[PDB]
Design a protein around this ligand. Structure first.
Ligand code: ZN
Ligand code: ZN
Lengths: 11, 54
């Protein structure tokens, strides 16, 4: 599942 | 990169982001500990909130 924590770009 | 500006719909808070679940339909956020029934950990796979699980 997706969370606020995982919902970001990691370049 | 930065997290998005999402807040939990139940408590209004954007804290505890590792526990702030996003629904795979409506994309609203819910803390594990704000859901009723309570969830003890982040579920594996896709997840849907009570309004979307149907
Ligand atoms: Zn909450
Ligand atoms: Zn939903």
């Amino acid at each position: 599942a997706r969370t606020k924590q995982t919902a970001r770009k990691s370049y | 990169g930065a997290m998005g500006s999402v807040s939990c719909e139940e408590c209004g808070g954007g804290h505890s982001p590792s526990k702030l679940l996003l629904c795979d339909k409506c994309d609203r956020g819910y803390h594990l500990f704000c859901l009723r029934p309570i969830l003890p950990s982040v579920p594996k796979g896709s997840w849907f909130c009570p309004s979307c699980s149907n």
